[PDB]
Structure 1
Amino acid sequence: FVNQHLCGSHLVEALYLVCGERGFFYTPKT
């Protein structure tokens, strides 16, 4: 039932771009 592993990869790509070239952190946790 894979889906969270590919779903987190669709956000990272649309995340660092939003910044433009500054930096960001990705920590998946409650």
Structure 2
Amino acid sequence: FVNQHLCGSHLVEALYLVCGERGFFYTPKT
């Protein structure tokens, strides 16, 4: 695999990809 800049909707698309059924949180304020 690789390391890249993932921002905005692309970041959440990647989380969906990687987490799937486990679910995830997207918390940009931190």
State TM-score, norm by structure 1. Answer: 0.53
Q: Hey, what's the Cα distance between the residues in 2 that align with 1:3 and 1:24?
A: 20
**Equivalences for residues 1-30 of structure 1 within 5 A:** 7-29=7-29
Which protein is bigger by CA-based radius of gyration?
A: 1
Unaligned runs of 5+ in 1: none
Stretches of structure 2 that go unaligned for 5 or more consecutive residues are none
Alignment RMSD (CA, Å): 6.5
Give structure 1 regions of 4+ aligned residues with deviation exceeding 4 angstroms: 1-6
More helix by share: 1
Alignment size in residue pairs: 30
